[PDB]
Design an enzyme around this catalytic site. Structure first.
Site, PDB file in Angstrom:
ATOM      1  N   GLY A  11     -13.481  12.489  -6.942  1.00 42.88           N
ATOM      2  CA  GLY A  11     -13.924  11.494  -7.911  1.00 42.88           C
ATOM      3  C   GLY A  11     -13.146  10.045  -8.644  1.00 42.88           C
ATOM      4  O   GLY A  11     -13.092   9.657  -9.689  1.00 42.88           O
ATOM      5  N   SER A  12     -13.654   9.509  -7.090  1.00 44.26           N
ATOM      6  CA  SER A  12     -12.465   8.331  -7.034  1.00 44.26           C
ATOM      7  C   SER A  12     -13.391   7.467  -8.312  1.00 44.26           C
ATOM      8  O   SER A  12     -14.315   7.353  -8.009  1.00 44.26           O
ATOM      9  CB  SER A  12     -12.134   7.930  -5.704  1.00 44.26           C
ATOM     10  N   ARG A  90     -22.979  14.281   0.207  1.00 45.24           N
ATOM     11  CA  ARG A  90     -23.913  14.638   1.326  1.00 45.24           C
ATOM     12  C   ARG A  90     -25.175  14.169   0.747  1.00 45.24           C
ATOM     13  O   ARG A  90     -24.872  12.690   0.278  1.00 45.24           O
ATOM     14  CB  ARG A  90     -24.854  16.014  -0.129  1.00 45.24           C
ATOM     15  N   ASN A 106     -23.841   3.553  -6.695  1.00 44.60           N
ATOM     16  CA  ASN A 106     -22.148   3.290  -5.783  1.00 44.60           C
ATOM     17  C   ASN A 106     -21.518   2.560  -5.008  1.00 44.60           C
ATOM     18  O   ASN A 106     -22.117   1.295  -5.467  1.00 44.60           O
ATOM     19  CB  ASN A 106     -23.044   4.189  -3.871  1.00 44.60           C
ATOM     20  N   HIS A 108     -18.882   1.374  -2.612  1.00 44.94           N
ATOM     21  CA  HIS A 108     -17.977   1.098  -1.127  1.00 44.94           C
ATOM     22  C   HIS A 108     -16.813  -0.269  -0.480  1.00 44.94           C
ATOM     23  O   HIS A 108     -17.216  -1.723  -1.638  1.00 44.94           O
ATOM     24  CB  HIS A 108     -19.475   0.697  -0.158  1.00 44.94           C
ATOM     25  N   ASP A 144     -25.142   3.158   2.484  1.00 41.09           N
ATOM     26  CA  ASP A 144     -24.964   1.277   1.632  1.00 41.09           C
ATOM     27  C   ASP A 144     -25.829   1.000   1.510  1.00 41.09           C
ATOM     28  O   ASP A 144     -25.346  -0.730   1.104  1.00 41.09           O
ATOM     29  CB  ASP A 144     -23.009   0.721   3.260  1.00 41.09           C
TER      30      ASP A 144
END
Length: 205
Positions: A11-12, A90, A106, A108, A144
């Site tokens: 869980g960064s 996933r 998200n 990256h 991404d």
């Protein structure tokens, strides 16, 4: 806005997100953390913080769509508005990503579109860039991919290793992931009908 975080491991940035929601003027609350893997460190982080957790094991479902439908049902039960992915490993199905279009974020560890895929810190070092960074974006079907909300440039230093570059980028992530969540949770940033970011002036003062 009610927020879910989906994880597969440590869980960064989860603590960064939790801490931000406890700030006085926060527009977000973390209401559930869902992992596809039992007993990972991110679950313990959530539980220690008093946040409900669920584990949804992909091996109990016939295929990706059925698995992701089980995730969505938990999201529905908890009246979730926004999903953040924090090391979720996933690939989400097309139906799921379509449903959550414009409400799922998200991060990256590069300045996308550079260094897509795994090992972006190693790719930055092998390439020899002097500037890398991190990117928070809405999730679209291609990984991404999806519209960029915030980016932060981070220098590559003479002598860096994967570890030292990764910790410098992680400090930037700890800044921009919560900042992006607040923009989206407040409605300041929304995804327009045209599929591009919209910066909205809100009626309420």
């Amino acid at each position: 806005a009610r927020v879910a975080v989906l994880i597969s491991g440590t869980g960064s940035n989860l603590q960064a997100l939790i801490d931000s929601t406890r700030e006085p003027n926060s527009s977000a609350q973390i209401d559930i953390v869902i992992s596809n893997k039992a007993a990972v460190a991110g679950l313990d982080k959530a539980e220690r913080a008093g946040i409900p957790t669920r584990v949804i094991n992909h091996k109990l479902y016939k295929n990706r769509v059925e698995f992701d439908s089980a995730i969505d049902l938990v999201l529905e039960e908890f009246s979730i508005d926004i999903v953040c992915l924090a090391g979720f490993m996933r690939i989400l199905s097309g139906p799921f990503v379509q449903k959550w279009n414009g409400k799922m974020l998200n991060i990256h560890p590069s300045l996308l579109p550079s260094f897509k895929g795994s090992n972006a810190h190693e790719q930055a070092l092998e390439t020899g860039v002097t500037v890398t960074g991190c990117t928070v974006h809405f999730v679209a079907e291609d990984v991404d991919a999806g519209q960029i909300i915030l980016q932060e440039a981070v220098p590559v230093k003479r002598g860096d290793t994967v570890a030292t570059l990764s910790e410098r980028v992680k400090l930037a992530e700890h800044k921009i992931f919560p900042a992006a969540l607040q923009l989206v949770a407040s409605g300041t940033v929304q995804l327009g009908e045209n599929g591009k970011i919209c910066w909205v002036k809100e009626e309420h003062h």
